[PDB]
mmCIF file of C-alpha atoms and ligand atoms in Angstrom:
data_model
loop_
_atom_site.group_PDB
_atom_site.id
_atom_site.type_symbol
_atom_site.label_atom_id
_atom_site.label_comp_id
_atom_site.label_asym_id
_atom_site.label_seq_id
_atom_site.Cartn_x
_atom_site.Cartn_y
_atom_site.Cartn_z
ATOM 1 C CA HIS H 4 69.616 99.052 36.293
ATOM 2 C CA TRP H 5 72.246 100.133 38.841
ATOM 3 C CA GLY H 6 75.550 98.302 38.881
ATOM 4 C CA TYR H 7 79.286 98.865 38.964
ATOM 5 C CA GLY H 8 79.974 99.588 35.293
ATOM 6 C CA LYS H 9 80.941 102.849 33.567
ATOM 7 C CA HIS H 10 77.348 103.475 32.574
ATOM 8 C CA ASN H 11 75.459 102.483 35.726
ATOM 9 C CA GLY H 12 78.117 102.505 38.509
ATOM 10 C CA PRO H 13 78.641 104.586 41.670
ATOM 11 C CA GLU H 14 78.958 107.919 39.881
ATOM 12 C CA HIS H 15 75.429 107.406 38.405
ATOM 13 C CA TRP H 16 73.623 106.207 41.548
ATOM 14 C CA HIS H 17 72.679 109.672 42.779
ATOM 15 C CA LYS H 18 70.217 110.101 39.903
ATOM 16 C CA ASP H 19 67.931 107.332 41.182
ATOM 17 C CA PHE H 20 69.006 107.642 44.853
ATOM 18 C CA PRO H 21 69.778 111.302 45.653
ATOM 19 C CA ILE H 22 70.882 110.370 49.174
ATOM 20 C CA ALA H 23 74.069 109.220 47.398
ATOM 21 C CA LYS H 24 75.243 112.805 47.982
ATOM 22 C CA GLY H 25 74.051 112.825 51.570
ATOM 23 C CA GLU H 26 75.726 113.715 54.835
ATOM 24 C CA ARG H 27 76.453 110.175 56.096
ATOM 25 C CA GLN H 28 77.369 108.021 53.106
ATOM 26 C CA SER H 29 79.595 104.957 53.220
ATOM 27 C CA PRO H 30 82.195 103.723 52.772
ATOM 28 C CA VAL H 31 84.847 106.149 53.915
ATOM 29 C CA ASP H 32 88.582 106.276 54.215
ATOM 30 C CA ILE H 33 89.584 105.538 57.793
ATOM 31 C CA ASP H 34 92.403 107.908 58.611
ATOM 32 C CA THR H 35 93.897 105.967 61.564
ATOM 33 C CA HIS H 36 95.794 108.961 62.899
ATOM 34 C CA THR H 37 92.594 111.116 63.053
ATOM 35 C CA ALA H 38 90.309 108.414 64.542
ATOM 36 C CA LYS H 39 89.709 109.216 68.213
ATOM 37 C CA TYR H 40 90.232 106.470 70.756
ATOM 38 C CA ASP H 41 87.070 106.388 72.844
ATOM 39 C CA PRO H 42 87.690 104.662 76.214
ATOM 40 C CA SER H 43 83.954 104.582 76.796
ATOM 41 C CA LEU H 44 83.313 102.229 73.812
ATOM 42 C CA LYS H 45 82.564 98.711 74.905
ATOM 43 C CA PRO H 46 84.078 95.475 73.569
ATOM 44 C CA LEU H 47 81.985 94.244 70.780
ATOM 45 C CA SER H 48 79.917 91.180 71.682
ATOM 46 C CA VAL H 49 79.625 88.831 68.730
ATOM 47 C CA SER H 50 77.351 85.938 69.670
ATOM 48 C CA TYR H 51 77.197 83.649 66.677
ATOM 49 C CA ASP H 52 77.005 80.177 68.449
ATOM 50 C CA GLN H 53 73.433 79.360 67.309
ATOM 51 C CA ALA H 54 73.620 80.878 63.840
ATOM 52 C CA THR H 55 71.413 79.161 61.203
ATOM 53 C CA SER H 56 72.556 79.801 57.686
ATOM 54 C CA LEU H 57 69.887 79.005 55.067
ATOM 55 C CA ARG H 58 70.822 79.805 51.448
ATOM 56 C CA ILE H 59 73.474 81.417 49.283
ATOM 57 C CA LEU H 60 72.415 83.593 46.389
ATOM 58 C CA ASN H 61 73.960 85.508 43.479
ATOM 59 C CA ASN H 62 71.937 88.673 43.292
ATOM 60 C CA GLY H 63 73.708 90.176 40.288
ATOM 61 C CA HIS H 64 75.806 92.503 42.457
ATOM 62 C CA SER H 65 77.394 90.217 45.053
ATOM 63 C CA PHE H 66 76.679 86.905 46.618
ATOM 64 C CA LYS H 67 74.994 86.675 49.974
ATOM 65 C CA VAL H 68 74.503 84.086 52.615
ATOM 66 C CA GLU H 69 71.152 84.514 54.366
ATOM 67 C CA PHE H 70 70.402 83.498 57.935
ATOM 68 C CA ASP H 71 67.330 82.636 59.936
ATOM 69 C CA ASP H 72 66.804 85.898 61.846
ATOM 70 C CA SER H 73 63.346 84.997 63.233
ATOM 71 C CA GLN H 74 64.867 84.571 66.726
ATOM 72 C CA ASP H 75 67.944 85.893 68.589
ATOM 73 C CA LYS H 76 70.351 83.260 67.247
ATOM 74 C CA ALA H 77 73.291 85.230 65.866
ATOM 75 C CA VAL H 78 73.512 88.663 67.428
ATOM 76 C CA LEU H 79 75.786 91.634 67.738
ATOM 77 C CA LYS H 80 75.685 93.936 70.750
ATOM 78 C CA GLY H 81 77.904 96.215 72.858
ATOM 79 C CA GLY H 82 80.598 98.199 71.107
ATOM 80 C CA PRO H 83 78.898 101.474 70.080
ATOM 81 C CA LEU H 84 75.515 99.793 69.899
ATOM 82 C CA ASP H 85 72.538 100.245 72.149
ATOM 83 C CA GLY H 86 70.362 97.153 72.122
ATOM 84 C CA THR H 87 70.591 93.855 70.156
ATOM 85 C CA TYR H 88 71.196 93.414 66.436
ATOM 86 C CA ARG H 89 70.378 90.152 64.622
ATOM 87 C CA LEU H 90 72.511 88.811 61.784
ATOM 88 C CA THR H 91 70.464 88.575 58.604
ATOM 89 C CA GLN H 92 73.077 88.054 55.871
ATOM 90 C CA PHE H 93 76.667 88.446 54.927
ATOM 91 C CA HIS H 94 78.206 89.286 51.549
ATOM 92 C CA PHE H 95 81.505 90.483 50.149
ATOM 93 C CA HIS H 96 82.912 93.136 47.854
ATOM 94 C CA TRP H 97 86.065 92.361 45.909
ATOM 95 C CA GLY H 98 88.381 93.528 43.119
ATOM 96 C CA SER H 99 89.632 92.436 39.722
ATOM 97 C CA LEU H 100 93.206 92.578 41.284
ATOM 98 C CA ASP H 101 94.437 91.922 44.780
ATOM 99 C CA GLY H 102 95.259 95.649 45.257
ATOM 100 C CA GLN H 103 91.614 96.760 45.198
ATOM 101 C CA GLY H 104 88.234 95.431 46.263
ATOM 102 C CA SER H 105 87.518 96.786 49.736
ATOM 103 C CA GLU H 106 84.965 99.547 50.219
ATOM 104 C CA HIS H 107 86.510 101.079 53.330
ATOM 105 C CA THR H 108 90.126 102.015 53.098
ATOM 106 C CA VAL H 109 92.636 102.488 55.862
ATOM 107 C CA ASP H 110 94.969 105.431 55.380
ATOM 108 C CA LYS H 111 94.009 105.087 51.710
ATOM 109 C CA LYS H 112 95.072 101.444 51.598
ATOM 110 C CA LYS H 113 92.651 99.176 49.679
ATOM 111 C CA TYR H 114 92.338 95.522 50.624
ATOM 112 C CA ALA H 115 91.591 92.692 48.196
ATOM 113 C CA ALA H 116 88.009 92.347 49.502
ATOM 114 C CA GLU H 117 85.714 93.231 52.360
ATOM 115 C CA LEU H 118 83.247 91.023 54.186
ATOM 116 C CA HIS H 119 80.054 92.663 55.528
ATOM 117 C CA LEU H 120 77.936 90.953 58.177
ATOM 118 C CA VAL H 121 74.630 92.814 58.157
ATOM 119 C CA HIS H 122 72.579 92.968 61.361
ATOM 120 C CA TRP H 123 69.340 94.774 62.232
ATOM 121 C CA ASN H 124 68.185 96.358 65.462
ATOM 122 C CA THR H 125 65.530 94.108 67.015
ATOM 123 C CA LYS H 126 63.633 97.133 68.424
ATOM 124 C CA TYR H 127 62.411 97.645 64.827
ATOM 125 C CA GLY H 128 61.038 94.123 64.456
ATOM 126 C CA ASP H 129 62.269 93.354 60.899
ATOM 127 C CA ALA H 130 65.225 94.297 58.722
ATOM 128 C CA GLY H 131 63.121 96.263 56.250
ATOM 129 C CA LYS H 132 61.751 98.574 58.872
ATOM 130 C CA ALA H 133 65.159 98.784 60.537
ATOM 131 C CA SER H 134 66.613 100.031 57.256
ATOM 132 C CA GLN H 135 64.353 103.132 57.507
ATOM 133 C CA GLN H 136 65.830 104.172 60.865
ATOM 134 C CA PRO H 137 69.016 106.051 61.566
ATOM 135 C CA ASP H 138 70.174 103.327 64.040
ATOM 136 C CA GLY H 139 68.482 100.455 62.228
ATOM 137 C CA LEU H 140 71.416 98.396 60.978
ATOM 138 C CA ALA H 141 74.908 97.487 62.166
ATOM 139 C CA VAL H 142 77.329 96.197 59.591
ATOM 140 C CA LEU H 143 80.471 94.493 60.845
ATOM 141 C CA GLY H 144 83.166 94.953 58.169
ATOM 142 C CA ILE H 145 86.196 92.760 57.879
ATOM 143 C CA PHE H 146 89.029 93.295 55.411
ATOM 144 C CA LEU H 147 90.494 90.440 53.399
ATOM 145 C CA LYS H 148 94.135 90.363 52.375
ATOM 146 C CA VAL H 149 95.652 87.724 50.161
ATOM 147 C CA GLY H 150 98.132 85.363 51.855
ATOM 148 C CA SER H 151 97.355 82.120 53.619
ATOM 149 C CA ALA H 152 93.952 80.449 53.139
ATOM 150 C CA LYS H 153 91.090 81.023 55.524
ATOM 151 C CA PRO H 154 89.711 77.511 56.284
ATOM 152 C CA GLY H 155 86.384 78.895 57.367
ATOM 153 C CA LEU H 156 85.860 80.525 53.993
ATOM 154 C CA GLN H 157 86.355 77.344 51.964
ATOM 155 C CA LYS H 158 82.772 76.060 52.242
ATOM 156 C CA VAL H 159 81.647 79.329 50.683
ATOM 157 C CA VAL H 160 84.225 79.252 47.878
ATOM 158 C CA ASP H 161 83.398 75.664 46.975
ATOM 159 C CA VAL H 162 79.704 76.339 46.359
ATOM 160 C CA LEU H 163 80.187 79.417 44.162
ATOM 161 C CA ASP H 164 80.276 77.365 40.905
ATOM 162 C CA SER H 165 76.633 76.448 41.635
ATOM 163 C CA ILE H 166 75.534 80.137 41.791
ATOM 164 C CA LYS H 167 77.613 81.477 38.913
ATOM 165 C CA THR H 168 75.011 83.790 37.417
ATOM 166 C CA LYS H 169 72.475 86.348 38.628
ATOM 167 C CA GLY H 170 69.430 84.810 40.269
ATOM 168 C CA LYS H 171 70.995 81.442 41.145
ATOM 169 C CA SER H 172 70.665 80.250 44.710
ATOM 170 C CA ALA H 173 71.604 77.114 46.624
ATOM 171 C CA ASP H 174 70.812 75.645 50.029
ATOM 172 C CA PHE H 175 73.642 76.595 52.370
ATOM 173 C CA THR H 176 72.988 75.241 55.816
ATOM 174 C CA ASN H 177 75.267 74.688 58.845
ATOM 175 C CA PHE H 178 77.775 77.405 57.838
ATOM 176 C CA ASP H 179 79.398 78.928 60.907
ATOM 177 C CA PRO H 180 80.267 82.626 60.419
ATOM 178 C CA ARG H 181 82.667 82.531 63.403
ATOM 179 C CA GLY H 182 85.094 80.951 60.962
ATOM 180 C CA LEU H 183 85.317 84.298 59.060
ATOM 181 C CA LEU H 184 86.443 86.457 62.013
ATOM 182 C CA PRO H 185 90.013 87.598 62.862
ATOM 183 C CA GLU H 186 91.435 87.033 66.366
ATOM 184 C CA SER H 187 90.996 90.668 67.499
ATOM 185 C CA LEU H 188 87.674 92.539 67.748
ATOM 186 C CA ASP H 189 89.408 95.925 67.947
ATOM 187 C CA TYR H 190 87.411 98.225 65.644
ATOM 188 C CA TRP H 191 86.622 101.616 64.235
ATOM 189 C CA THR H 192 83.052 102.865 64.210
ATOM 190 C CA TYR H 193 81.150 105.713 62.555
ATOM 191 C CA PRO H 194 77.561 106.457 61.378
ATOM 192 C CA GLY H 195 77.007 105.753 57.739
ATOM 193 C CA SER H 196 74.901 104.147 55.027
ATOM 194 C CA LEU H 197 74.276 101.176 52.886
ATOM 195 C CA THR H 198 77.034 101.061 50.273
ATOM 196 C CA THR H 199 74.597 99.927 47.605
ATOM 197 C CA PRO H 200 71.305 101.426 46.397
ATOM 198 C CA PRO H 201 69.094 102.448 48.034
ATOM 199 C CA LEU H 202 72.003 103.940 50.052
ATOM 200 C CA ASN H 203 69.847 104.442 53.143
ATOM 201 C CA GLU H 204 71.541 106.289 55.978
ATOM 202 C CA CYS H 205 70.687 103.606 58.523
ATOM 203 C CA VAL H 206 74.003 101.925 59.367
ATOM 204 C CA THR H 207 76.280 101.989 62.407
ATOM 205 C CA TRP H 208 79.550 100.756 60.771
ATOM 206 C CA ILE H 209 81.873 98.650 62.846
ATOM 207 C CA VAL H 210 85.081 97.969 60.873
ATOM 208 C CA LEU H 211 87.578 95.557 62.412
ATOM 209 C CA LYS H 212 91.205 96.647 62.432
ATOM 210 C CA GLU H 213 92.644 93.201 61.864
ATOM 211 C CA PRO H 214 92.138 91.762 58.396
ATOM 212 C CA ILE H 215 91.642 88.056 57.675
ATOM 213 C CA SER H 216 93.954 86.331 55.292
ATOM 214 C CA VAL H 217 92.499 84.403 52.354
ATOM 215 C CA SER H 218 94.414 82.609 49.659
ATOM 216 C CA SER H 219 94.803 83.750 46.114
ATOM 217 C CA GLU H 220 92.835 80.624 45.057
ATOM 218 C CA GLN H 221 89.958 81.613 47.362
ATOM 219 C CA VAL H 222 89.673 85.124 45.924
ATOM 220 C CA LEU H 223 90.117 83.794 42.380
ATOM 221 C CA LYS H 224 86.946 81.829 42.881
ATOM 222 C CA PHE H 225 85.005 85.014 43.811
ATOM 223 C CA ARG H 226 86.180 86.496 40.487
ATOM 224 C CA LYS H 227 84.685 83.651 38.499
ATOM 225 C CA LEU H 228 81.166 84.755 39.424
ATOM 226 C CA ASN H 229 79.110 86.626 36.811
ATOM 227 C CA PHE H 230 77.070 89.812 37.122
ATOM 228 C CA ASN H 231 74.899 88.675 34.183
ATOM 229 C CA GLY H 232 72.124 86.056 34.211
ATOM 230 C CA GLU H 233 72.534 82.609 32.589
ATOM 231 C CA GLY H 234 72.396 82.943 28.759
ATOM 232 C CA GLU H 235 73.161 86.758 28.622
ATOM 233 C CA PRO H 236 76.694 88.202 27.666
ATOM 234 C CA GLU H 237 79.373 87.241 30.272
ATOM 235 C CA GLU H 238 80.597 90.017 32.620
ATOM 236 C CA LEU H 239 82.749 88.772 35.466
ATOM 237 C CA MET H 240 81.612 89.905 38.901
ATOM 238 C CA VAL H 241 84.637 91.932 39.951
ATOM 239 C CA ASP H 242 85.111 95.429 41.292
ATOM 240 C CA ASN H 243 81.715 95.448 43.044
ATOM 241 C CA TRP H 244 82.864 98.087 45.527
ATOM 242 C CA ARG H 245 81.762 101.662 46.021
ATOM 243 C CA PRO H 246 84.692 104.052 46.465
ATOM 244 C CA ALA H 247 85.252 106.107 49.610
ATOM 245 C CA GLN H 248 82.716 108.949 50.073
ATOM 246 C CA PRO H 249 83.176 112.280 51.819
ATOM 247 C CA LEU H 250 83.434 112.042 55.626
ATOM 248 C CA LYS H 251 81.601 115.370 56.009
ATOM 249 C CA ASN H 252 80.701 116.138 59.592
ATOM 250 C CA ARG H 253 81.665 112.740 61.021
ATOM 251 C CA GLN H 254 84.199 111.476 63.522
ATOM 252 C CA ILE H 255 85.486 107.920 63.302
ATOM 253 C CA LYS H 256 86.007 106.437 66.778
ATOM 254 C CA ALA H 257 88.523 103.698 67.657
ATOM 255 C CA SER H 258 87.959 101.040 70.343
ATOM 256 C CA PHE H 259 91.789 100.728 70.805
ATOM 257 C CA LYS H 260 95.143 102.431 71.334
HETATM 258 N N1 WWO U 301 83.123 78.811 58.652
HETATM 259 S S1 WWO U 301 82.816 76.922 58.647
HETATM 260 O O1 WWO U 301 81.310 76.421 58.975
HETATM 261 O O2 WWO U 301 83.091 76.506 57.204
HETATM 262 C C1 WWO U 301 84.350 76.556 59.591
HETATM 263 C C2 WWO U 301 85.432 75.909 59.041
HETATM 264 F F1 WWO U 301 85.372 75.246 57.834
HETATM 265 C C3 WWO U 301 86.601 75.848 59.777
HETATM 266 F F2 WWO U 301 87.600 75.186 59.278
HETATM 267 C C4 WWO U 301 86.705 76.476 61.045
HETATM 268 S S2 WWO U 301 88.299 76.367 61.863
HETATM 269 O O3 WWO U 301 89.185 77.127 60.847
HETATM 270 O O4 WWO U 301 88.280 77.279 63.113
HETATM 271 C C5 WWO U 301 89.145 74.814 62.374
HETATM 272 C C6 WWO U 301 88.188 73.661 62.698
HETATM 273 O O5 WWO U 301 87.192 74.063 63.603
HETATM 274 C C7 WWO U 301 85.656 77.214 61.582
HETATM 275 N N2 WWO U 301 85.762 77.893 62.860
HETATM 276 C C8 WWO U 301 84.644 78.401 63.650
HETATM 277 C C9 WWO U 301 85.164 78.950 64.945
HETATM 278 C C10 WWO U 301 86.243 79.928 64.972
HETATM 279 C C11 WWO U 301 86.714 80.422 66.209
HETATM 280 C C12 WWO U 301 86.089 79.926 67.431
HETATM 281 C C13 WWO U 301 85.000 78.985 67.430
HETATM 282 C C14 WWO U 301 84.548 78.474 66.173
HETATM 283 C C15 WWO U 301 84.475 77.255 60.778
HETATM 284 F F3 WWO U 301 83.389 77.913 61.246
HETATM 285 N N1 WWO U 302 77.420 96.980 51.871
HETATM 286 S S1 WWO U 302 76.199 96.945 52.772
HETATM 287 O O1 WWO U 302 76.323 96.095 53.889
HETATM 288 O O2 WWO U 302 75.725 98.290 52.971
HETATM 289 C C1 WWO U 302 74.967 96.095 51.828
HETATM 290 C C2 WWO U 302 75.067 95.723 50.528
HETATM 291 F F1 WWO U 302 76.209 95.907 49.768
HETATM 292 C C3 WWO U 302 74.101 95.070 49.864
HETATM 293 F F2 WWO U 302 74.224 94.685 48.591
HETATM 294 C C4 WWO U 302 72.904 94.766 50.522
HETATM 295 S S2 WWO U 302 71.627 93.945 49.575
HETATM 296 O O3 WWO U 302 72.300 92.925 48.752
HETATM 297 O O4 WWO U 302 70.525 93.406 50.461
HETATM 298 C C5 WWO U 302 70.977 95.095 48.328
HETATM 299 C C6 WWO U 302 70.168 96.190 48.956
HETATM 300 O O5 WWO U 302 70.996 97.329 49.247
HETATM 301 C C7 WWO U 302 72.705 95.164 51.874
HETATM 302 N N2 WWO U 302 71.489 94.866 52.552
HETATM 303 C C8 WWO U 302 70.998 95.766 53.628
HETATM 304 C C9 WWO U 302 69.636 95.370 53.994
HETATM 305 C C10 WWO U 302 69.284 94.030 54.464
HETATM 306 C C11 WWO U 302 67.929 93.749 54.813
HETATM 307 C C12 WWO U 302 66.994 94.748 54.681
HETATM 308 C C13 WWO U 302 67.300 96.036 54.257
HETATM 309 C C14 WWO U 302 68.625 96.371 53.906
HETATM 310 C C15 WWO U 302 73.755 95.826 52.496
HETATM 311 F F3 WWO U 302 73.611 96.166 53.819
HETATM 312 ZN ZN1 ZN U 303 78.520 95.399 51.641
#
């Protein structure tokens, strides 16, 4: 099936998902000098006070924390968005080395990892239907650099040994995603896509300028995950990032400076 290897990785995805060569694919390189400051963009409103995390899962590509999104508990609005977007899950992409792992790049710089908080537009009723709409999803992207530890990440890191292989899940309640955010909500935004199959062109990307710092030990724990299922040949889950795709006819807007 699709993956990140030589034989099934990003360069092969277009054969099953022809939109891979589409006009609004993600991620992209954010050229900070070319991004246009838009004084009409609003501050992003991240309202995560009543978030209800449920479960953490290794899906063979990444790991994801899923949330109760059956009410307006953890929502994103404002910024470039019209309407209200409910948090459904977050996941990460990361490298085999600290100098790679992010999907977006900033002036061609790669970060060690990228956190994606995936939200869906409530006007479409459910995340599946939202993913079929051009304004269906909003993904808040946060870069991770290696330096000091991020305390709010540790609860995630410490459960990963229990979901080592594809298809493993664990209960993961009372996790507060506010502990994964940087101080500033200054961002770049552009219209794009899922960065994994099926690569739907349904995402308003909101990429925060300020990275979070995580420790080497934290990111080392991500790299102990396996792409393979229990009792198949071991392939460490590393380098689960799609490279930057052509910007084509898009402008990246900045909320700042
Ligand atoms: N992400 S979590 O459920 O594991 C957790 C922590 F473990 C944690 F240590 C923190 S902490 O680093 O801020 C210090 C003790 O509270 C937060 N923080 C959530 C938060 C962040 C900013 C403003 C309000 C809440 C936090 F959410
Ligand atoms: N990077 S990204 O945020 O575009 C991303 C993924 F990398 C990713 F793996 C996923 S997934 O694990 O759910 C695999 C499917 O692409 C989603 N999910 C987007 C989504 C969530 C709910 C309903 C429909 C799409 C997803 F949005
Ligand atoms: Zn992602």
